[PDB]
Design a protein around this motif. Sequence first.
Motif, PDB file in Angstrom:
ATOM      1  N   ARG A 191      16.018  12.044   8.582  1.00  0.00           N
ATOM      2  CA  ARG A 191      15.384  12.923   7.607  1.00  0.00           C
ATOM      3  C   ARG A 191      14.456  13.918   8.295  1.00  0.00           C
ATOM      4  O   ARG A 191      14.391  15.091   7.907  1.00  0.00           O
ATOM      5  CB  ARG A 191      14.619  12.098   6.573  1.00  0.00           C
ATOM      6  CG  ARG A 191      15.457  11.670   5.375  1.00  0.00           C
ATOM      7  CD  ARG A 191      14.587  11.056   4.279  1.00  0.00           C
ATOM      8  NE  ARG A 191      14.129   9.713   4.627  1.00  0.00           N
ATOM      9  CZ  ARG A 191      12.852   9.343   4.718  1.00  0.00           C
ATOM     10  NH1 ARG A 191      11.875  10.210   4.487  1.00  0.00           N
ATOM     11  NH2 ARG A 191      12.552   8.092   5.041  1.00  0.00           N
ATOM     12  N   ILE A 248       7.405  -1.549   6.396  1.00  0.00           N
ATOM     13  CA  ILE A 248       8.077  -0.256   6.310  1.00  0.00           C
ATOM     14  C   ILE A 248       7.400   0.697   7.289  1.00  0.00           C
ATOM     15  O   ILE A 248       6.261   1.118   7.075  1.00  0.00           O
ATOM     16  CB  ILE A 248       8.051   0.293   4.878  1.00  0.00           C
ATOM     17  CG1 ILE A 248       8.718  -0.705   3.926  1.00  0.00           C
ATOM     18  CG2 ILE A 248       8.751   1.647   4.811  1.00  0.00           C
ATOM     19  CD1 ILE A 248       8.383  -0.493   2.472  1.00  0.00           C
ATOM     20  N   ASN A 249       8.116   1.057   8.360  1.00  0.00           N
ATOM     21  CA  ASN A 249       7.515   1.832   9.438  1.00  0.00           C
ATOM     22  C   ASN A 249       7.143   3.248   9.017  1.00  0.00           C
ATOM     23  O   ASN A 249       6.349   3.894   9.709  1.00  0.00           O
ATOM     24  CB  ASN A 249       8.466   1.884  10.636  1.00  0.00           C
ATOM     25  CG  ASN A 249       8.441   0.607  11.455  1.00  0.00           C
ATOM     26  OD1 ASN A 249       9.414  -0.148  11.479  1.00  0.00           O
ATOM     27  ND2 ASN A 249       7.323   0.357  12.127  1.00  0.00           N
ATOM     28  N   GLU A 250       7.687   3.746   7.904  1.00  0.00           N
ATOM     29  CA  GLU A 250       7.345   5.095   7.466  1.00  0.00           C
ATOM     30  C   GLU A 250       5.871   5.209   7.097  1.00  0.00           C
ATOM     31  O   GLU A 250       5.298   6.302   7.165  1.00  0.00           O
ATOM     32  CB  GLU A 250       8.218   5.498   6.276  1.00  0.00           C
ATOM     33  CG  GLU A 250       7.951   6.908   5.765  1.00  0.00           C
ATOM     34  CD  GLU A 250       9.106   7.477   4.960  1.00  0.00           C
ATOM     35  OE1 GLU A 250       9.927   6.686   4.449  1.00  0.00           O
ATOM     36  OE2 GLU A 250       9.193   8.718   4.840  1.00  0.00           O
ATOM     37  N   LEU A 298       6.199  -2.143  -3.012  1.00  0.00           N
ATOM     38  CA  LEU A 298       7.086  -1.594  -1.992  1.00  0.00           C
ATOM     39  C   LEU A 298       6.757  -0.157  -1.608  1.00  0.00           C
ATOM     40  O   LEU A 298       7.138   0.276  -0.514  1.00  0.00           O
ATOM     41  CB  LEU A 298       8.545  -1.653  -2.466  1.00  0.00           C
ATOM     42  CG  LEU A 298       9.176  -3.043  -2.539  1.00  0.00           C
ATOM     43  CD1 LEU A 298      10.515  -2.993  -3.253  1.00  0.00           C
ATOM     44  CD2 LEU A 298       9.343  -3.625  -1.146  1.00  0.00           C
ATOM     45  N   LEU A 311      15.010   7.331   8.381  1.00  0.00           N
ATOM     46  CA  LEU A 311      13.708   7.970   8.538  1.00  0.00           C
ATOM     47  C   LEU A 311      13.763   9.074   9.587  1.00  0.00           C
ATOM     48  O   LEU A 311      13.356  10.212   9.332  1.00  0.00           O
ATOM     49  CB  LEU A 311      12.657   6.926   8.914  1.00  0.00           C
ATOM     50  CG  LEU A 311      11.274   7.455   9.297  1.00  0.00           C
ATOM     51  CD1 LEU A 311      10.645   8.199   8.130  1.00  0.00           C
ATOM     52  CD2 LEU A 311      10.379   6.312   9.757  1.00  0.00           C
ATOM     53  N   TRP A 315      15.019  -3.044  -1.631  1.00  0.00           N
ATOM     54  CA  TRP A 315      14.559  -4.370  -1.240  1.00  0.00           C
ATOM     55  C   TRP A 315      14.637  -5.314  -2.431  1.00  0.00           C
ATOM     56  O   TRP A 315      14.288  -4.941  -3.555  1.00  0.00           O
ATOM     57  CB  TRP A 315      13.126  -4.332  -0.708  1.00  0.00           C
ATOM     58  CG  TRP A 315      12.718  -5.569   0.028  1.00  0.00           C
ATOM     59  CD1 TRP A 315      12.023  -6.633  -0.475  1.00  0.00           C
ATOM     60  CD2 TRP A 315      12.973  -5.872   1.405  1.00  0.00           C
ATOM     61  NE1 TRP A 315      11.828  -7.578   0.503  1.00  0.00           N
ATOM     62  CE2 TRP A 315      12.400  -7.136   1.667  1.00  0.00           C
ATOM     63  CE3 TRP A 315      13.630  -5.199   2.442  1.00  0.00           C
ATOM     64  CZ2 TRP A 315      12.466  -7.740   2.922  1.00  0.00           C
ATOM     65  CZ3 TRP A 315      13.696  -5.804   3.690  1.00  0.00           C
ATOM     66  CH2 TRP A 315      13.115  -7.060   3.918  1.00  0.00           C
ATOM     67  N   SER A 359       8.980   4.464  -0.442  1.00  0.00           N
ATOM     68  CA  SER A 359      10.195   4.560   0.361  1.00  0.00           C
ATOM     69  C   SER A 359      11.300   3.600  -0.052  1.00  0.00           C
ATOM     70  O   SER A 359      12.475   3.961   0.027  1.00  0.00           O
ATOM     71  CB  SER A 359       9.864   4.320   1.839  1.00  0.00           C
ATOM     72  OG  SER A 359       9.152   5.418   2.378  1.00  0.00           O
ATOM     73  N   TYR A 360      10.962   2.388  -0.480  1.00  0.00           N
ATOM     74  CA  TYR A 360      11.943   1.367  -0.817  1.00  0.00           C
ATOM     75  C   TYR A 360      11.892   1.080  -2.310  1.00  0.00           C
ATOM     76  O   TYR A 360      10.818   0.811  -2.859  1.00  0.00           O
ATOM     77  CB  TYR A 360      11.680   0.069  -0.046  1.00  0.00           C
ATOM     78  CG  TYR A 360      12.159   0.057   1.384  1.00  0.00           C
ATOM     79  CD1 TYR A 360      11.837   1.083   2.255  1.00  0.00           C
ATOM     80  CD2 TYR A 360      12.919  -0.997   1.868  1.00  0.00           C
ATOM     81  CE1 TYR A 360      12.273   1.068   3.567  1.00  0.00           C
ATOM     82  CE2 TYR A 360      13.355  -1.023   3.176  1.00  0.00           C
ATOM     83  CZ  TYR A 360      13.029   0.011   4.021  1.00  0.00           C
ATOM     84  OH  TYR A 360      13.466  -0.015   5.324  1.00  0.00           O
ATOM     85  N   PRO A 377       8.974  -6.385   3.258  1.00  0.00           N
ATOM     86  CA  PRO A 377       9.247  -5.571   4.446  1.00  0.00           C
ATOM     87  C   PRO A 377       8.023  -4.891   5.033  1.00  0.00           C
ATOM     88  O   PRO A 377       7.069  -4.537   4.335  1.00  0.00           O
ATOM     89  CB  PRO A 377      10.232  -4.520   3.910  1.00  0.00           C
ATOM     90  CG  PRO A 377       9.777  -4.309   2.491  1.00  0.00           C
ATOM     91  CD  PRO A 377       9.196  -5.631   2.009  1.00  0.00           C
TER      92      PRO A 377
END
Lengths: 507, 507, 503, 509
Positions: free
Chosen positions: D115, C430-432, D401, D112, D431, D404-405, C428
């Motif tokens: 939060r 991940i835009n964060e 990852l 996101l 994920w 966050s994931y 992925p």
Amino acid sequence: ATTVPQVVSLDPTTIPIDYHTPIDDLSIEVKDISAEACPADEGLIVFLLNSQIKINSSVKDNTINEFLKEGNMENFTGKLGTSKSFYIANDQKKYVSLAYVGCGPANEETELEIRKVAYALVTLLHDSKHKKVSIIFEIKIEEALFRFFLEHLFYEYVTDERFKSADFIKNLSLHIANADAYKGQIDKARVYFYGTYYAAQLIAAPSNYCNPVSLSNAAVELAQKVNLECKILDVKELEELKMGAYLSVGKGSMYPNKFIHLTYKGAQTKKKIALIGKGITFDSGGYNLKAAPGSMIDLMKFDMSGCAAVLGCAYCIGTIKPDNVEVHFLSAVCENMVSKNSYRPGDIITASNGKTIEVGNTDAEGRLTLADALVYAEKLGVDYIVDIATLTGAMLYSLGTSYAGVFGNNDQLINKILSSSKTSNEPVWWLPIINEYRSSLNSKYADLNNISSSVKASSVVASLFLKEFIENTPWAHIDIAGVSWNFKARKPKGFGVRLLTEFVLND
Amino acid sequence: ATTVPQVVSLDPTTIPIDYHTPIDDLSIEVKDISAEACPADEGLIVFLLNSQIKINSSVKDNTINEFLKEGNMENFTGKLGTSKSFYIANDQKKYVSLAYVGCGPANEETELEIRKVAYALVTLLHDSKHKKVSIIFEIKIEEALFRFFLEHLFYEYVTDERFKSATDFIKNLSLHIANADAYKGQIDKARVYFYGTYYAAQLIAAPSNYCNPVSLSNAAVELAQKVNLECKILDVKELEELKMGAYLSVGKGSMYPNKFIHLTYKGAQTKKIALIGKGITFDSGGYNLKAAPGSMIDLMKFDMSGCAAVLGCAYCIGTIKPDNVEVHFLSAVCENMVSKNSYRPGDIITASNGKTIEVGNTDAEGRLTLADALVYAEKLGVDYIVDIATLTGAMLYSLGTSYAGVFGNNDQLINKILSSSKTSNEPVWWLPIINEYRSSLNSKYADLNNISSSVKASSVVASLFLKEFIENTPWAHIDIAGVSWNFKARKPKGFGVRLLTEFVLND
Amino acid sequence: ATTVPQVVSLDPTTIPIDYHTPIDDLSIEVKDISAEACPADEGLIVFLLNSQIKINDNTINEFLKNMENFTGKLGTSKSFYIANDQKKYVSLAYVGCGPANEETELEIRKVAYALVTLLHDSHKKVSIIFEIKIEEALFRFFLEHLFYEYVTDERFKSADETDFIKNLSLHIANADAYKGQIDKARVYFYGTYYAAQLIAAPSNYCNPVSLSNAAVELAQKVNLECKILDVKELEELKMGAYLSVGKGSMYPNKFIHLTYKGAQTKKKIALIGKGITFDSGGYNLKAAPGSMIDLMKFDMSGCAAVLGCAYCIGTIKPDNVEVHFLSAVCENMVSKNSYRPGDIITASNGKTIEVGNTDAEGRLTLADALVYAEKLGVDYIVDIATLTGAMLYSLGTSYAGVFGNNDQLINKILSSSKTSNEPVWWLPIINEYRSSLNSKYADLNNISSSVKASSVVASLFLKEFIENTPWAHIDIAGVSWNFKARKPKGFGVRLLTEFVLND
Amino acid sequence: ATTVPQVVSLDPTTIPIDYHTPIDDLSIEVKDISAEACPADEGLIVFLLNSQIKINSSVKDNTINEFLKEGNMENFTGKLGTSKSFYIANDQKKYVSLAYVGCGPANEETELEIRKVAYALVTLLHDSKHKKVSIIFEIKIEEALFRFFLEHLFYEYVTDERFKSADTDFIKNLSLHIANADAYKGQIDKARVYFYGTYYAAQLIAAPSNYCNPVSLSNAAVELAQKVNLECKILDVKELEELKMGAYLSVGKGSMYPNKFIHLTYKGAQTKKKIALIGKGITFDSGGYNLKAAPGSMIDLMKFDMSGCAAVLGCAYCIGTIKPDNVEVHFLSAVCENMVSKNSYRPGDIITASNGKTIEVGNTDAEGRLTLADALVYAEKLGVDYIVDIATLTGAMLYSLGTSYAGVFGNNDQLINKILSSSKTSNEPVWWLPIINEYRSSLNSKYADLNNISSSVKASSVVASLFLKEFIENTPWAHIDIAGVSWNFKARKPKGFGVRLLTEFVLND
Ligand SMILES: [Zn+2]
Ligand SMILES: [Zn+2]
Ligand SMILES: [Zn+2]
Ligand SMILES: [Zn+2]
Ligand SMILES: [Zn+2]
Ligand SMILES: [Zn+2]
Ligand SMILES: [Zn+2]
Ligand SMILES: [Zn+2]
């Protein structure tokens, strides 16, 4: 004496301490350089000379005195630390030893030059077996610096043989102008030397000899020798006093915690002082083990140097017995080890004043024991609290190995420490407590962390932490992490004994 | 307009510099807090308040003034750095923004508190687009610290956009304070001191592909023209004639020729000072490459921060134009790179004073350039020589990021620097030059080594090396390696401009 | 601009490339195991069996019914010599394939390795009996890997046709379905072998100049359009990110742009390959333990895979597809002229980039290649590159990672991975973590402040140079080089070819 | 066995737990944004707005409503996280607090953005003394994300003060105004339960290792099972030796606290899937003799190596409170402590798991998978349909990852997609990562059946999953690695990650 726990029957149960040195059998006379010239009849005659200056005094021996008047020192420069010695026949055709020792440019002598001259001189003493030594002071030297010269001379002369499996000098004559102005320093030099010598003996003792139990036993014996009140607090009373920070550091050790509390009370013919010494008999680092390159785990027996400096000063004050002064000598002694019972990185512990501490690093354990010692000290209701500790290795990168650092909350107390640094000739430099770093000790869950998240100035950060355990007493903190141990000579310095003693005596 | 060498046509050839800031279009007025009360007309009204203290001032608008009288600031307590802001309607139905900013306990404000208050206030401005701002000083603050508050306010307000690929700012600022007449003299000074700091920060923040020895010397020429200073840029050939072997050795590996900046100010004849700034436009470390974890090679564009503070001081002096003083602004500008032409570890180089230097580490290059700059400065026949440089990273482990360290050979000049630190509010602490470490610089073959063999007190050692190039002039050295770059904010501070300017103006 | 600059007269001036392999002298035929039974005769006869399953012509078809010690496990092998109708000769071998119907690309790579080990230690006529059920795509992969393991790279040995097989027969049930995969295997093998030859070539042989000359030679052999852009054109195109990386190199930057146009009877594709012929790391020098500086000649593996696919497409010549093969080639070196850590550079799309680390140079060159590819007006942009060493800790050395901004494009890459049998796994964006690339002074930083998920951060950076085109990014840093075998895999050639031919 | 051993009398003997939060004293109501428009009569009113979008909802107070129809957004962009506050006189001439909050572009809100919006509003609640709050939702949110907004609001609103030496004023009324309110009213009770379950897990993780040890943690599980009426079974060392759990028992040899195996059981009312949830429960991981001494090993934060156990227990609270029908859940954790001692197991030791397999200990810091091995064997013996483990296993997750994931591995495609589906509805991102069989040989040992680490493959997250799979024989099994996502490094607190994910997984089966 409390019984020292052992693993095998061969483990030692006491700290060997020499309470007698060759200096105790030494005669010391100050004699006027001109009106009481050196006879040069036996032994060693050493001239302390400045650079490019010729010998100006005389010896009563005609043969030797005629040699001196020739003014031929070969290639001796007077350069600091340089040396030249030789044997030559007297008037009774005995062979005496003449020596020149350089002291550097005239009128520029500090504790640095004094230490170099005393070391070069002792090199000639270790290479000989004289009974009489004469030192001719052809230099300008202040009284306290003259005393320091004798203290360091004796410090370099007396070797430590306690841990080796295997007829010293008996008369010392000092020839200097205006001799009467220096005679009052001689017996002060005797006391200051042994106090420093006592501290070094405790520091040099390996951790299997010097543990919390044996070190507390030695302080009990010391208090009886110099007539001091002695109190040793055990774990149960420490639990009652809620010393959670100090007790947590010792959890992993086979030796129980021992809190030394000696008290000197002088004759009333006013001031109350608390002296705190860090007393970690061995610092492995805890689970934050000292495993990085350059962490010097093999030298961590010296993490009780602060406690040794306080006990060495206890000897000096207990011997000199000043009037109108009350002094408490304190040290929370323990051992920082790795075990199933050790306290862990991340543990939250409660200090004796109710403040909670998150242990971000178990190798920052000294300040945890000092926190409970400081709270104990302030409860005594004293006018000044001074602590001395091998705290931050960052001292090696700031002031280095010669100058100690002093922090405090009271400018007047700090200035007294600096004054005592000058009259004791133990160098100290004032460093600031920078309030901007205080927030880096904040904790998400506890009241404080014991280490900083962001700030690399460890010495300043550690002073901020300790300050959280003094409510409103003048307090000063002396970090001797850099100056305590002489890395080149592989031996302790006994740093702090004379500094703290001068602070008590001038007060 | 010396041509800047390029590798590709896209390489820049100038340093973009903003000679005009939003502060040049802002009106600044100081008004009495009670006799010229704030009207709450439009824009933003900010109350600066201490902990647990109510608002005591008044606004001329009756609607808002009646709101303030209710004395309900919700949960704003006055703690340092906190703030509360909102919009409220005044007597003309227009929505005004009110705000409270905490300044901490009363009478304890220092440069630290002021910087935090100014930062919290600018947070409100960057979240707004007011045309008028009114700051109501309900705190006790000295004049120099009041000026500092304005200097830092602007410092946080004006953002650097020169390198973004992508009028709109405040136009009227009113300052309401008791006894306002005593503070009006500071405003114009704040305007000049701010831009001097702003100018230095722009040179430091410029990346090394923009700010190289050629382009930075070009900028110094332009600056000297804009504030009427004598200017002279020495080139390689003249530097060879002057035998600056140390300075020239550092730049051997760079594609940009060395450039020695020499600006001069001379006031009306109605003292002579040399200011030296370290000017390494990029320090890769040389063959002692900055490859160790934590060496921050990506930030080494900041190794010319000393040069920037000297040029920023030059703007301030060239603008204020004081009488009865002559100032020379010096910087030996070069670049420390890796190449077939670079000088190697172990090379022996000769300085302009004849002393030979063994290069134990090519990453200790700043002191080599300063060495030839100090010799050059002492030949000018000045009364004081002060250098400022990002010398030793060890400052992060001693004084840290807030306080700079000052060394020197003259206590009267050191104290003048300390005094300038108090009135400029750029903190500085006096650190010692410990002579015991000098022998650590001895070289078996050269006169000196540029780094120590034994001592880890890197900052003291560097000061001992620089001292070897001052013969008989009062000289001081300010190490700003720890304070120059704000790591948390990722931007420079412009440290030193106001410190050095205050030094020149006071005497 | 076409001759390689030299420091000494002995520096090589071109890349030695074998355009002919022993496989071009090998005749291949597919025979039905049932209908036209295998005629034993004389030579090597190889049996591909599963575990616990026993074999099912001259004398030894009664030798057909003994092997014990051999269990059929994956990689195991034996040997035997036979009677024959005529009599006195041969070799005959058993080679295991593990449990039945559990054969993937992994098992077949190991089966092919065991068979090549037989040949490396020994004839001219070889027969392989497929007593295993494998589909047609994995059957082609077995021949592709067999040839890959069989042809040795000797271009850089000092020692000096008759050493190799000349006839190969493959016996398999329903052999009529596999016959079409033979010539596809020849094409796919050489595309992978060609890419591997460029990667293995040391950096003193393979430099920006000689690699672009090799692309010129390849394009001439398949009549692909070829345009090599030089520094002057790259400057006017404002490729400041790509040109900054090569500032400290003695070799001028060369931007490769090949073009294939099929016969129209539609889809336009752009393939980008990272082409750093050597990555010293720049002033962010590769000096820490584990940085593998001695193998950094493989940082042009993406360009190699793109050129290898250019060979396949230029040879198969599919209809109704336009393909652009791009690579911004250069060298990342240390010099007085190199770009410095902290320099701010301007990409061709106007975005300013702060160089937080000069060892993150690949994404700087790709940034200008992406902007260049989007201006061509294509439907899909696919880049393949040895970007982040974090892949070794993510998917490892067997699976490559694919990121992208378009789910349909990504699933086409995933499906191409299935039919090419080059494993790929979807990861992925991940835009964060996007905020961690913000620069205080430039628009972007090329490395992240706080995020350690470094392969994800790199994709967030690349995405900043695609405005509105489907784009996918394949990170092959972990799969390109076989560390235990000390040779490249040529990973990506067959994957990209499958993506183009299926369109 | 239940006594917490102490070295000194000042050592804690219990984990302090807040079983009551200010949320339990807060009234919450969902009202339709149109049919029950806010009155703007008192308290604080907050509008959640998208960027560059004018106020579209109305309010009963005519003065305030007139203020709204006029812009007053001169510096408010609606940008994510930005805000603007007002003091406004209402019809009755009392000042009212009103604030705008930006949520970013319309129809682009994910977990996101939510939060960040929830955080922005907690600031306004902290900076306001109003105890009545009305939130007007002028944004498009689905039910599950709307619930996530309240859950995170509570998570940021309540602070952990259990270990502060200092020292209850909070909001008492919360009104939520949104279009089609009837469809969101069921999310209120769910958000309450989901919040405390997350909050409870974060409290166990944040507890220091001297408070939260294997004994006090199992005792907390006993207390939890009583408060929520679950069957509780704590297996002590003797029974563990009988079950031949050599891998699990070897890890705790060097600890002063005995191993404790937690087994909680929920059985829903019959109106029949059986689930086993396993959490990694290392109360402190020093690394063993493979001590965590390398830079960046974060030994000071390894109290969080029981984050899996905490997520499982937090799930037990949610399931024990919601009490779904026709489901049987087992909550398991092999709890221990990994310490350095004369009694510790050594690098290179060969130990026998409860399924008979022998394991060479190539690294004592890879002890989590050793405790999971015996827990996985125990779980399959229960005869369940699904086995799911959650553990802070590999620090490599921070490089794959990130923070966050989380990563999910498994041997069953259907179960993995159920975990992924639970991830979307719980808004805890996960994920799917592969179990690559080619790396299996890297775990072989010359002498044991297995090594617990690979010395050639650096993809440690995949390798660990290959090791754990050696202890599942024939049951759908998924493994969730939360080493990177469990602890919020910037905020310096735990997330309670996994509670809501696992609860959603149980409820929708
Ligand atoms: Zn320590
Ligand atoms: Zn210590
Ligand atoms: Zn340097
Ligand atoms: Zn430098
Ligand atoms: Zn690179
Ligand atoms: Zn690269
Ligand atoms: Zn571990
Ligand atoms: Zn663990």
